[PDB]
């Protein structure tokens, strides 16, 4: 590990998001910021809100610059409205650099802020093509690279605990690492495998094959990427295109048929509980996602365990049972590889080489019999045809 200053700089959990500490303004105003590879705007609460115990105060910053422009971002989940400006930004547990970046000061929001998440803003790490109001609003990471010597690359190690974290526990727990400008080798085991970033907007990738316990889901691979597949730390679940979701759930039910689970469970709405320590991990199948490799006709696979797709949740009775919600859900906007999937891997966003790397995470949750895996290579033909075109 060569980036020790950034190791363990994340806090949070899949259900409420992972955040990094940042400072905005002069003198510096400390704020916790959601790490979101699924959007491209740097936005912070800038006005009182029931769920915020602190917010960006522009009138207290000598370096604040008002852009005199409004901004609106409608996420899949929620929305916020704000005022555009720029100011000096730093990451305390990051590269020792200060940059002037665009900041959307949030003045109105609906279903955006999460009660108890402990974060006051969002860091959209994706490309300008999806930034609001338009692609002219330079994303934070672009500013960072243009203004400093920081390598055009960042890596994420999101660490799920494998068990419920209460309100005090999640505040004192290390939730992972965001390494700005590099790859830290202590965060993963085995080899890193790269998949091409298909297009620079979201971090778009191409899935070429899907297996449930080694059994081919056997769908036209173009279904797996309808209308796109993205890597998104700002989404909890593995979200799958309607048809893929239906087929995957049918296969996961078949593999786990020794136990019957209520429809509410499969809909990701209701929790299932087992007596402490008795979770039957072995009846649930591993899920393998094959990703286009950098070599022609070559792919690699990332394999996740139910310890990743079953999300730990506190029992409504706070009892001693181990409870979980099914963290795979349907999408109408393509595949979303959310935080529960990212928790099994060290993920390298290699912007400079337009590729995303995957390696088994040093902090993924597993059991004595199975482990998450990143394996390759596999001969795979016509992978370009798995990509969806409008």
Ligand X SMILES: CCCN(CCC)C(=O)c1cc(C)cc(C(=O)N[C@@H](Cc2cc(F)cc(F)c2)[C@H](O)[C@@H]2NCN(Cc3ccccc3)C2=O)c1
- Residue pair 245/223 in contact by the 8 Å Cβ criterion: no
> Taking CB under 6 A as the rule, does residue 95 contact ligand X?
no
Which residues 44-73 are close enough to bind ligand X by CB under 6 A?
73
Which residues 6-25 are close enough to bind ligand X by CB under 6 A?
15-17
Member of 2, 77, 191, 319 binding ligand X (CB under 6 A): 77
> 196 pairs with which residues across the strands?
355
Q: Which is nearer to ligand X, 83 or 204 (CB)?
A: 204
Q: Which is nearer to ligand X, 130 or 372 (CB)?
A: 130
CA atoms within 13 A on the CB side of 105: 23
Q: Which is nearer to ligand X, 201 or 265 (CB)?
A: 201
The H-assigned helical ranges of the chain are 140-147, 169-172, 242-255, 263-266, 306-309, 339-342
Which residues 222-241 are close enough to bind ligand X by CB under 6 A?
232, 234-237
Stretch that binds ligand X, among 24-32, 60-68, 74-82, 274-282 (CB under 6 A): 74-82
- Residue pair 216/209 in contact by the 8 Å Cβ criterion: yes
- Residue pair 98/24 in contact by the 8 Å Cβ criterion: no
User: Within 10 Å of residue 116's Cβ, how many Cβ atoms?
Assistant: 11
Query: Taking CA 14 as the corner, what is the angle to CA 373 and CA 34, rounded to the nearest 5 degrees?
Result: 115
* Residue of 36, 87, 142, 322 marked active site: 36
Member of 112, 154, 284, 300 binding ligand X (CB under 6 A): 112
> Taking CB under 6 A as the rule, does residue 39 contact ligand X?
yes
- DSSP 8-state symbol, 247: H
In angstroms, rounded to a whole number, what is the distance separating the alpha carbons of residues 74 and 185? Answer: 37
Member of 63, 76, 118, 143 binding ligand X (CB under 6 A): 76
> Taking CB under 6 A as the rule, does residue 308 contact ligand X?
no
- The question of whether 232 is a catalytic residue gets the answer yes
Tell me the closest approach of the beta carbon of residue 278 to ligand X, in angstroms.
28
* Residue of 142, 184, 232, 322 marked active site: 232
In angstroms, rounded to a whole number, what is the distance separating the alpha carbons of residues 379 and 377? Answer: 7
- Residue pair 103/58 in contact by the 8 Å Cβ criterion: no
What positions carry a catalytic annotation? 36, 232
Query: Can you give the binding site for ligand X, defined by CB under 6 A?
Result: 15-17, 34, 36, 38-39, 73-78, 112, 114, 130, 232, 234-237
């Amino acid at each position: 590990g060569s980036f020790v200053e950034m190791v363990d700089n994340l806090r949070g959990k899949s259900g409420q998001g992972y955040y990094v500490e940042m400072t905005v303004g002069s003198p510096p105003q400390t704020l916790n910021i959601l790490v979101d590879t699924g959007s491209s705007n740097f936005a912070v609460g800038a006005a009182p809100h029931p769920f915020l115990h602190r917010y960006y105060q522009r009138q207290l910053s000598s370096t604040y610059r008002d852009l005199r422009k409004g901004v609106y971002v409608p996420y899949t989940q929620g929305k916020w409205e704000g005022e555009l400006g720029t100011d000096l930004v730093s990451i305390p547990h990051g590269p020792n650099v200060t940059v002037r970046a665009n900041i959307a000061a949030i003045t109105e929001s609906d279903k955006f802020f999460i009660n108890g998440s402990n974060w006051e803003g969002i860091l959209g790490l994706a490309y300008a093509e999806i930034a609001r109001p338009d692609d002219s609003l330079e994303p934070f990471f672009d500013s960072l690279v243009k203004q400093t010597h920081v390598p055009n690359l960042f890596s994420l190690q999101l660490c799920g605990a494998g068990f419920p974290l209460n309100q005090s526990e999640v505040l004192a727990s290390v939730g992972g690492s965001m390494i700005i400008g590099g790859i830290d080798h202590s965060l993963y085991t085995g080899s890193l495998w790269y998949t091409p970033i298909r297009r620079e907007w979201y971090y778009e990738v191409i899935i070429v094959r899907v297996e449930i316990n080694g059994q081919d889901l056997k769908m036209d691979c173009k279904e797996y990427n309808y209308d796109k597949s993205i890597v998104d730390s700002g989404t909890t679940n593995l979200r799958l295109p309607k048809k893929v979701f239906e087929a995957a759930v049918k296969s996961i039910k078949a593999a786990s048929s020794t136990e019957k689970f209520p429809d509410g469970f499969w809909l990701g709405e209701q929790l299932v509980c087992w007596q402490a320590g008795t979770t039957p991990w072995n009846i649930f199948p591993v899920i393998s996602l094959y990703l286009m490799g950098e070599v022609t006709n070559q792919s690699f696979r990332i394999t996740i365990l139910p310890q990743q797709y079953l999300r730990p949740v506190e029992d409504v009775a706070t009892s001693q049972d181990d409870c979980y919600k099914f963290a795979i859900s349907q999408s109408s906007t393509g595949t979303v590889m959310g935080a529960v999937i990212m928790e099994g891997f060290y993920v390298v966003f290699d912007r400079a080489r337009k590729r995303i790397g995957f390696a088994v995470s040093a902090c993924h949750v597993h059991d004595e019999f199975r482990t998450a895996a990143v394996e390759g290579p596999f001969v795979t033909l016509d992978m370009e045809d798995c990509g969806y075109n409008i």
